[PDB]
């Protein structure tokens, strides 16, 4: 079994910033990459961001490109997610990934699903 | 930027066979096999299908479906009250360099 | 009816891994 513990989501201001953290148990975090998807209620699940096991950044979604930062520690079993310049848009839920391939560059499915935290963007 | 098309929502009768079709540029779902994930509402999304057809430990037999050409199928037969989700179909595009995921359908019965 | 892994909570910085052929009115004597 892998639990993906999902935090540091909470109501925001627009031009405030914001850090996810996700839990890793259950399995080696080092061996799997690790992915971020959120999904607003109502709308269809949109992909963020991806990492891999040398931690190196797989790449971000076009919209949150060069205003979402990823990294992981394999030590902490620990992958956060920095956001910046939130907007409404960037508003959802946001559901930690674990991916089987490390390269995740085909074949690459999702095993484990994290509940997820709510980010909330308004004044 | 190439978008997973799928049909906004389906209802089947219990014991009826339902489709689910997953549109995709070629060099998305061409390259690397279509994941379904069926998520329940209110619900962390579940994996349905690894590789297309190849199912994951906890998936019923009766899930079925075969992706031909650039088209994702999703087959379910035997269905019963309570399977109602909405369907995801992920493919990651080698052009784009992102994941990429469908719009997602409505199954129900009423 | 196995319990498996039932004999730890937590596993995390592995820095050895090994499989064999198991060790094991019969008498296994270890040293
Ligand atoms: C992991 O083990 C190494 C050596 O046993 C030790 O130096 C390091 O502090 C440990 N780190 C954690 C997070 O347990």
């Known amino acids: 079994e892998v639990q993906l513990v999902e935090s540091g989501g909470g109501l925001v201001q627009p031009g405030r910033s914001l850090t996810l953290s996700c839990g890793a148990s259950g399995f080696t975090f080092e061996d799997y990459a690790m992915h971020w998807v959120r999904q607003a209620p109502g709308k269809g699940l949109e992909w963020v961001s991806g990492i891999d096991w040398n931690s190196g950044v797989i790449g971000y979604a076009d919209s949150v490109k060069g205003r979402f930062i990823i990294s992981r520690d394999n030590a902490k079993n620990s992958l956060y997610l920095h956001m910046r310049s939130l907007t409404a848009e960037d508003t959802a839920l946001y559901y930690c990934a674990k991916d089987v391939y490390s390269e995740s560059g085909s074949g690459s499915y999702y095993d484990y699903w994290g509940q997820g935290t709510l980010v909330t963007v308004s004044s | 930027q190439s978008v997973l098309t799928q049909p906004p929502s389906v209802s089947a009768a219990p014991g009826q066979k339902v489709a689910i079709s997953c549109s995709g540029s070629?060099?998305?779902?061409?390259?690397?096999?279509v994941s379904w994930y069926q998520q329940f509402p209110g619900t962390a999304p579940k994996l349905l299908l690894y590789?297309?057809?190849r199912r994951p430990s906890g998936i019923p037999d009766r899930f079925s479906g075969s992706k031909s050409g650039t088209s994702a199928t999703l087959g379910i037969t035997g269905l019963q009250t309570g399977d109602e989700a909405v369907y995801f179909c992920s493919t990651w595009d080698n052009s784009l360099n992102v994941v990429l995921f469908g719009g997602g359908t409505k199954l129900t019965v009423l | 009816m196995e319990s498996e892994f039932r004999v730890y909570s937590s596993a995390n910085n592995c820095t050895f891994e090994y499989v064999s052929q198991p060790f094991l009115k019969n008498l296994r004597e270890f040293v």
């Open positions: 070629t060099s998305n779902i061409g390259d690397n096999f």
């Open positions: 590789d297309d057809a």
